[PDB]
């Protein structure tokens, strides 16, 4: 029944802001991590952060870490990814994911459609 | 005020264990306290019982100022780490007790060789040996970098089983020789495994 | 007594705050022994760096520090004593150093030969330098999942890079070994978008 939907995408400056947000239906988010990925047209799926249930933090890939911040409103059952100091470097398609493991092992079985987020 | 355990690492299941803390302070509470190898503390007794313990559970000698641990009917579940403390601001610096009915046994190394990015992993496990512990180094002590030797696991045999393995350069595959060499000093075993890519 | 979380990650600088429910604490590093660090609720122990401190009442304490130092990652055990006289701890907080995610890299080894002529096979499957610490492996045998017949090992956080490693080992009769060709282990972690399976095929 889930469905994962992101927005925020869109085209900006390099050295600009952006803040992309994932809305999940059908089931609530507040018992399991969700995470952001983020894919280039002929490249896989990187992990880009994670953001574990309330007071169990968060945690993001090299590439991303000091620029980028995830957070959670389990209450509209959301979560959101603030990008900073973008560089051109980051122009992908965003991605977010539940992990339905309650332990954090990342059993990654629902999927969002993604963002398009580029950079120029 | 320092504290000293003292008595047998190895005691037979349904024996006794009996161990010995020699105490810079008088004793006119002084604890005993375990940590089992899950790493949870429980406080056994104390002289001047813990009720899970108390039917087969301490006694003190003025004269060398030592107090004295006796656990009777011991079982594999008593393996654990066992300090002695003055209440809970001195402690002492732990012991070992393994509770097992297994018999001294050298191990086996085993070979885990290299096969088909441009790192690769391969290393040594060392399997059915007993007791605890052995020693691993990679050519002589030569190559530390990228070295990994796991903790033993006890296996349903009663004999314990680790891996120590390494990552190095997938070029170095066929000019560098890699050689474990695993010590057994209960046994007196030493041997010095050659692993070579498959 | 009830630590919350069972495992804190912090990174240098952040303020840390560990919840005994229902006060004593005790800081332990790896194998040496448990030392006073926090006594009689606020009260720091002798050598205890001053962004220690101990706050709670009631049925809730807290252990905080003010700024992480890497040298405060450790085991934290609260500690009570009840005049039903009873010394009780807690199960523990580790206070672990946080990094950025790294996902593992998987590697599988096939029972050697010698092994085998003893009639064991043992299949061992590396997990190495990953962070967070939480993963999960299942063995595979011919696509059918393996239970109860593995064991598995997991480093200290390495004092350099702060990943672990995980080192779990298959074991079977050398009949039953022989009675199947595809031998897998898939990981999953959360710096992974699909799982990782790493196989070999017994004849090759
Ligand atoms: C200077 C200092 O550190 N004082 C402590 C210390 O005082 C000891 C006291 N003067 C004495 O000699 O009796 O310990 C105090 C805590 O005292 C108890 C407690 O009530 O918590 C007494 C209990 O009898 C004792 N129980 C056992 C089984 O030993 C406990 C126990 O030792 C601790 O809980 C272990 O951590 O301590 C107080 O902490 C003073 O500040």
């Known amino acids: 029944x889930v469905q994962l939907x992101x927005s925020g995408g869109g085209x900006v400056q390099x050295g600009x802001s952006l803040x992309l947000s994932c809305x999940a239906?059908?089931?609530?988010?507040?018992?399991?991590?969700?995470?952001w990925x983020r894919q280039x047209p002929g490249x896989x799926r990187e992990x880009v952060?994670?953001?574990?249930?309330?007071?169990?933090?968060?945690?993001?890939?090299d590439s991303x870490x000091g620029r980028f911040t995830x957070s959670x409103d389990x209450x509209x059952x959301x979560x959101x990814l603030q990008x900073x100091x973008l560089x051109x470097x980051d122009x992908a398609x965003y991605y977010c994911?539940?992990?339905?493991?309650?332990?954090?092992?990342?059993?990654?079985?629902?999927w969002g459609x993604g963002t398009x987020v580029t950079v120029s | 005020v320092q504290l000293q355990e003292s008595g047998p690492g190895l005691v037979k299941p349904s024996q006794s264990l009996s161990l010995t803390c020699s105490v810079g302070y008088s004793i006119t509470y002084w604890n005993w306290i375990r940590q089992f190898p899950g790493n949870k503390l429980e406080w056994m007794g104390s002289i001047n019982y813990n009720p899970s313990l108390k039917d087969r559970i301490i006694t003190r000698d003025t004269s060398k100022n030592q107090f004295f641990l006796k656990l009777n009917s011991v079982t594999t579940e008593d393996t654990a780490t066992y300090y002695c403390a003055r209440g809970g601001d001195y402690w002492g610096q732990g012991t070992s007790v393994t509770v097992s009915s297994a018999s001294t046994k050298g191990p086996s190394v085993f070979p885990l060789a290299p096969s088909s990015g441009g790192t690769a992993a391969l290393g040594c496990l060392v399997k059915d040996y007993f007791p605890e512990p052995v020693t691993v180094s990679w050519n002589s002590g030569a190559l530390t970098s990228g070295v990994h030797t796991f903790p033993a696991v006890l296996q349903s045999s009663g004999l314990y089983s680790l891996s120590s393995v390494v990552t190095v350069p997938s070029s170095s595959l066929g000019t560098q020789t890699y050689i474990c060499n695993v010590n057994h000093k209960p046994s007196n075993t030493k041997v010095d495994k050659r692993v070579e890519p498959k | 007594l009830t630590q919350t979380p069972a495992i804190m990650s912090a990174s240098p600088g952040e303020k840390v705050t560990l919840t005994c429910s229902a006060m004593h604490w005790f800081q332990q590093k790896s194998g040496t022994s448990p030392k006073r660090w926090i006594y009689d609720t606020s009260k720091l122990a002798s050598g205890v760096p001053a962004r220690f401190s101990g706050s709670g009442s009631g049925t809730s304490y807290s252990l905080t520090i003010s700024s992480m130092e890497a040298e405060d990652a450790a085991a934290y055990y609260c500690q009570q004593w009840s005049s039903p006289p009873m010394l009780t701890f807690g199960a523990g907080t580790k206070l672990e150093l946080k990094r950025t995610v790294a996902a593992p890299s998987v590697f599988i080894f096939p029972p050697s030969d010698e092994q085998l002529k003893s009639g064991t096979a043992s299949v061992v499957c590396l997990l190495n330098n990953f962070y967070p610490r939480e993963a999960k492996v299942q063995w595979k045998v011919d696509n059918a999942l393996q239970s109860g017949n593995s064991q598995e090992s997991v480093t200290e956080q390495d004092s350099k890079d702060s990943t672990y490693s995980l080192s779990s080992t298959l074991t079977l009769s050398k009949a039953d070994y022989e009675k199947h060709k595809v031998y897998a282990c898939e990981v999953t972690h959360q710096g992974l978008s699909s799982p990782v399976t790493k196989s070999f095929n017994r004849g090759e």
């Open positions: 059908x089931x609530x988010x507040x018992x399991x991590x």
């Open positions: 994911x539940x992990x339905x493991x309650x332990x954090x092992x990342x059993x990654x079985x629902x």
């Open positions: 953001x574990x249930x309330x007071x169990x933090x968060x």
